[PDB]
């Protein structure tokens, strides 16, 4: 019984880990592509000078 | 169907299977007890010597003592009466029929591959029979080729690297730094609460106190801190007699003379350091695996937080741009046993085996031409 | 404090000094060391062996930039191809760069790049691939005098014996409307069933073969023969001024290698004298007997 | 043996007045100077590459003479007006010249559009404009160079006549423009398109020649026409990148400059050129069910003699020999009392 | 015994899509940081007057 | 095998 | 980097025989075949060069079949007779294949002052040989 | 490297840097240039 519920702990814990990785990794692609955006158009804005 | 066996040694454990198998089928402690008290009993049973489970029961009558020590073997005869244990009491099996397969430490003196090989053709007339580093088999429990390993065992620590399949000679780092010790340091330090522990038996009790309440501080100021203001990091043992005894502080303080070796005066580095300096020695291209690839082996290395504190201070001593991670199976205590189950079943290891015939024109050197 | 050195270069051999030092820089084998495991051993050996060819390829000056692509098919399972991806030179490629994709270009292993595949350029191959199962190596090339022949009315003349070993040569008209599926239907029959050699209208050469050195063997004789019937026919302007052989009647005429292993045998020991050290495995991996 | 030059020493040198886009533009025409010379096409300078600066204030970049192309650094490059006087100099110790300026000049004051300039020497060039015919469509290539103006060249661009004559027959929407027995000249909004058409009129020009060499006669060539089916080259390069969202979109020239430019840059050429895709190499992932996953992502004074300590148990082991008496200290209290 | 041998095996399924969120986070990070570094460069080409 | 091969 | 490869090796050798100036004349045969390499007008294996070893008993010297012209050297050539027939082989682990050489043998029992042969296949004199003017 | 890695067609032009490496052309040193005129000199250079 102390086993299993060792293994149960272990469960919880990973299991809320990779949702807060998973939503941390959703914003940084998120956001990364803005920048892409963005040096995008001051490199365009470049060009037309 | 005539298969291989594994029997894997090491101070203070013994293994022993089939080659193929999943599980080992005897697993027992590499002990030898000699009855201390005077014996009046007229009619009952009473033997000579006890060896392996049946001596740890009887531990209040026995003087226990090891035939290996830091991977060394001191008597030979004890080493015999186990050999003997392991192949007709536990597996029940003649060891003239199948091929055995053994392993040892990687460096040791001549004498002993030597010695082991002319006992096992002799005594057992072992047909044919094959010696093995022990953390090389551990990589390949793990299954990769490739990486840095680090054996950690009640007799000896070490780290190999081995890069596809070769384990470089000049980078092994052997540091004498075992369980066995961390238990005698856990007494010394146990001497200063009022719990006092003197004979052997009660070096198996402490040794299965360090086993249960143990385990490896993150921080080792922060957690002195907390320790002596707070009264939450207290566990209670309860001894085999009745008594009660409260770990308390030490809990933390016997596993990190692993890290430290000043407590115990040992001149020699930490274990993260020697991982460190053993990746030093090999060539920079191979680096990147090296730190890319590295698994925990041997029981020492199952106190609870070993792998986040191993990969601070290896991190701590690594280049910024360098990435490290830390492996660590949960059967890191039986993977070398496991490696020698592989490395018997495949299809060209049967003429990897050492012939019996060769043996007689070759002599008790022919493992070093052969392994 | 120093860069990787660049071999000194001719006014005319610029480039193949370049292809030269960046391959002495980059091993085109970087797979091996803990990527060993991630591949099998068959996968790998067609990855070493594609890569290998890429660099041989930029170095004989048969490089178009990006425009020309170079495909195996995988043994194992099915329907799984290689391709360089789109955006990076013959130069460069390396065997763990290669991206795996399956049929019609959806791509299945993604590789050791950013880079993603042209599906416009394997068009083509996956018609190939469609129209014949044994054919394993599709190589689709682009000489200088390729497309001078190519624009040719009469085509390839059998005026020399390396386009006599070639056999029946398939013409692709060029219709250049860039329809959607009606060209995978017409290169199909174009090739009919047995063709190694396919010359497009205008466009360039490609060759096809069961294992790759067969192919190179044969794409190198379609290059070596497209110059002798350039110059011959430039020299002639005339039936009258040449002699043509027919092949009908010239055709009379351990276990070894096969078809073409020769070559490519040959010039992987030029690249590994060169300082690739790709790892091609070799039939016989010393030219001289050890001594006694 | 050291061909390696650095291409970008602006910030080594540190003594030019450089403009707002200085920086970009020298590293960008700089590196179309130095795939000219590994090419081949052309090594000793004739004034082949002009760039435009801004258009605001027309400034025009243009090579310094008696400069080989493998020596072309992008700091040693000059700046010069559209009427041919210097406005900055670069750090190179040589006689200035401008001669060959004007005629691209001439291609300045017509159309705004166009901002770089490539004119080619090179012996395939020269033999398909010395030709009777143009570029014949006999050959992809020469698909893909697109619609072109001839014109007659006879040395001179510095009269008002000639230059007039040339902007009148130039027209509004033409790329390349063939100079009769004297070559061809690429116009580009960007640089990465007028590089472009450049290696592509290269390639159509040999592959003319050689059928040409061929055949006798233009007959027997069997070409196809462009204007027939008029096609907009859509469906070209079909992307399934995966760092960025697959897109049909890109420019004339991108797609094949990067990878030139990144070759450039791996030797050790310190170009500024600034990436549109970044590139990263990183190691192959694995699938096999053999992996196992990571865990994680004073006591003593320090001034002391041993030899005061046995003296001193030497001084109470004399007392002990001599065995004198001596009583205890007696306390104050019955100090008092007596 | 049941429900030990249950959550050990569901903490075996779950190890894999935790290293595999973690790698996919590491090569944002390295695309993020070749980013920064073009904006750099970006900015210090159009800050000059 | 090949580790065989040459050696040990 | 492997460096150039020596072209006189058979004092390392020092097994196979000898007949009269054979040490010399050997390497003269190699030392054409690094002369071709240098020409670019042949780089693939084949019968190119072959040498008349002395005017009696009909000994010659050609080169062995897979061997690329930049790695050959003198204790790597083959000795046949007449009829093509092995009879002392070289240096060089190769397959032996004597097919390409019955050419050169018509032209060598025609003419008995002929001692060396040359053959090449580059693009030039094979087109002067495809035309007719010649 | 005594010998620069050979071009498929330009290994001329390699022997041809490679003995520029082994032997200058400029042989005349300051003792050797002993009852030497100076025009000579410069010409020898240039030719
Ligand atoms: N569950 C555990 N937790 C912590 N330490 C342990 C545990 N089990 C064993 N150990 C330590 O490991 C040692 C046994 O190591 P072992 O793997 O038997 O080495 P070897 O097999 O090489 O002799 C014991 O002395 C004990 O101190």
């Not at chain 2, 006992?119 to 057992?124: G, H, L, P, R």
């Not at chain 2, 020697?274 to 890319?292: E, G, P």
């Not at chain 4, 041919?84 to 705004?112: M, N, Q, W």
């Not at chain 5, 049941?2 to 590491?26: G, N, P, Y």
């Amino acid at each position: 019984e102390t086993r299993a519920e060792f293994a149960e702990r272990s469960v919880t814990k990973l299991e809320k880990s990779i949702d807060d990785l998973e939503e941390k990794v959703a914003h940084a692609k998120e956001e990364n592509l803005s920048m892409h955006q963005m040096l995008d158009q001051t490199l365009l804005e470049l060009n037309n000078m | 169907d005539i298969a291989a066996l594994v029997v894997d040694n090491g101070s203070g454990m013994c293994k022993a299977g089939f080659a193929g198998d999943d599980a080992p089928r005897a697993v027992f402690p590499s002990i030898v007890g000699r009855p201390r008290h005077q014996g009046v009993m007229v009619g009952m049973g009473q033997k000579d010597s006890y060896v392996g489970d049946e001596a740890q029961s009887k531990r209040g009558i026995l003087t226990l003592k090891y035939p290996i020590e830091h991977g060394i073997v001191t008597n030979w005869d004890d080493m015999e009466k186990i050999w003997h244990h392991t192949f007709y009491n536990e597996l029940r099996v003649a060891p003239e029929e199948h091929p055995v397969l053994l392993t040892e430490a990687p460096l040791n003196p001549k004498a002993n591959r030597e010695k082991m090989t002319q006992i096992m053709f002799e005594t057992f007339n072992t047909p044919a029979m094959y010696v093995a580093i022990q953390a090389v088999l551990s990589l390949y429990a793990s299954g990769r080729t490739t990486g840095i390993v680090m054996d950690s065992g009640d007799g000896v620590t070490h780290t190999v690297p081995i890069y596809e399949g070769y384990a470089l000679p000049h980078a092994i780092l052997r540091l004498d730094l075992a369980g066995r010790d961390l238990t005698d340091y856990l007494m010394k330090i146990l001497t200063e609460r009022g719990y006092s522990f003197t004979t052997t038996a009660e070096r198996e009790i402490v040794r299965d106190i360090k086993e249960k309440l143990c385990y490896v501080a993150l921080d080792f100021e922060q957690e002195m801190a907390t320790a002596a203001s707070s009264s939450s990091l207290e566990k209670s043992y309860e001894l085999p007699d009745g008594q009660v005894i409260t770990i308390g502080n030490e809990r933390f303080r016997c596993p990190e003379a692993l890290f430290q070796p000043s407590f115990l005066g040992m001149e020699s580095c930490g274990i993260h350091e020697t991982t460190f300096n053993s990746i030093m020695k090999c060539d920079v291209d191979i680096r990147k695996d090296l730190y890319a690839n590295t698994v925990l082996s041997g029981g020492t290395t199952m106190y609870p937080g070993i792998a986040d504190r191993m990969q601070k201070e290896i991190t701590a001593l690594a280049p910024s741009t360098m990435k490290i991670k830390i492996i660590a199976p949960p059967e890191r205590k039986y993977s070398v046993w496991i490696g020698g189950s592989i490395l018997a079943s495949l299809s060209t290891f049967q003429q990897m085996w050492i012939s019996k015939q060769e043996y007689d024109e070759s002599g008790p050197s022919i493992v070093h031409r052969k392994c | 404090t120093n860069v990787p050195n660049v071999y000194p270069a001719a006014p005319q051999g610029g480039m193949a000094a370049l292809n030269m030092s960046l391959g002495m820089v980059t091993p085109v084998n970087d797979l091996r060391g803990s990527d060993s495991i991630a591949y099998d051993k068959g996968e790998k050996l067609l990855r070493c062996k594609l890569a290998a060819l890429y660099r041989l390829a930029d170095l004989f000056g048969w490089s178009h930039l990006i425009y020309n692509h170079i495909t195996t098919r995988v043994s194992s399972e099915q329907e799984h191809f290689l391709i360089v991806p789109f955006g990076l030179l013959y130069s460069e490629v390396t065997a763990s760069s290669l991206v795996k994709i399956n049929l019609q270009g959806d791509v299945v292993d993604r590789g050791s790049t950013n880079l993603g595949v042209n599906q416009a350029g394997f068009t083509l191959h996956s018609a190939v691939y469609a129209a014949r199962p044994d054919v394993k190596c599709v190589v689709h090339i682009h000489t200088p005098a390729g497309a001078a022949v190519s624009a040719m009315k009469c085509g390839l003349l059998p005026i020399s014996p390396e386009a006599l070993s070639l056999g029946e040569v398939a013409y692709h008209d060029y219709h250049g409307i860039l329809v959607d599926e009606e060209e995978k239907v017409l290169i199909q029959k174009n090739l009919g069933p047995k063709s190694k050699v396919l010359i497009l209208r205008n466009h360039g050469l490609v060759s096809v073969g069961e294992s790759v050195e067969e192919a190179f063997y044969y794409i190198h004789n379609l290059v070596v023969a497209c110059e002798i019937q350039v110059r011959t026919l430039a020299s002639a302007g005339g039936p009258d001024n040449l002699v043509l052989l027919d092949p009908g009647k010239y055709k009379a005429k351990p276990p070894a290698w096969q078809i073409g292993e020769q070559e490519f045998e040959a010039l992987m020991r030029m690249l590994d004298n060169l300082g690739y050290r790709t790892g091609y495995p070799y039939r016989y991996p010393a030219l001289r007997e050890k001594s006694k | 043996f050291s061909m390696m030059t650095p291409i970008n020493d602006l910030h080594t040198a540190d003594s030019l007045n450089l403009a707002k886009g200085e920086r970009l533009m020298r590293c960008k025409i700089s590196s179309v100077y130095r795939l000219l010379d590994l090419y081949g096409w052309a090594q000793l300078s004739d004034t082949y590459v002009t760039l435009r600066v801004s258009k605001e204030q027309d400034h025009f970049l243009i090579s310094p003479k008696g400069v080989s192309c493998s020596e072309v650094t992008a700091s040693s490059l000059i700046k010069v007006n559209i009427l041919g006087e210097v406005v900055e100099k670069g750090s190179s110790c040589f006689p200035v010249d401008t001669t060959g300026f004007c005629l691209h000049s001439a291609i300045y004051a017509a159309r705004p559009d166009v901002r770089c300039i490539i004119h080619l020497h090179t012996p395939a060039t020269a033999a398909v404009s010395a030709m009777k015919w143009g570029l014949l469509p006999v050959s992809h290539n020469a698909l893909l160079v697109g619609d072109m103006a001839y014109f007659d060249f006879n040395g001179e661009m510095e009269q008002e006549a000639d230059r007039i004559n040339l902007q009148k027959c130039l027209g509004p929407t033409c790329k390349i423009l063939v100079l009769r027995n004297h070559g061809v000249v690429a116009l580009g909004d960007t640089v990465e398109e007028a590089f472009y058409k450049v290696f592509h009129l290269q390639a159509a020009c040999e592959i003319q020649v050689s059928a040409l060499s061929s055949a006798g006669g233009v007959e027997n060539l069997i070409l196809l026409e462009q204007e027939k089916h008029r096609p907009h080259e859509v469906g070209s390069v079909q992307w399934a990148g995966s760092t960025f969202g697959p897109m049909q979109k890109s420019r004339l020239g991108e797609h094949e400059f990067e990878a030139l430019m990144r070759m450039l840059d791996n030797l050790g050429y310190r170009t500024g050129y600034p990436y549109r895709y970044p590139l990263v190499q990183e190691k192959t992932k694995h699938k096999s069910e053999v992996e196992i996953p990571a865990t994680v992502t004073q006591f003593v004074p320090l001034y002391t003699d041993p030899q005061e300590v046995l003296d001193m148990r030497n001084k109470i082991r004399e007392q002990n020999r001599q065995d004198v008496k001596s009583a205890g200290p007696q306390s104050q209290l019955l100090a008092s009392v007596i | 015994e049941t429900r030990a041998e249950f959550a050990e095996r569901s903490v075996a399924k779950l190890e894999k899509t935790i290293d595999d969120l973690e790698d996919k986070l590491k090569c944002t990070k390295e695309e993020h940081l070749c980013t920064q570094r073009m904006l750099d460069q970006t900015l210090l080409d159009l800050n000059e007057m | 095998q090949e580790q065989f091969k040459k050696g040990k």
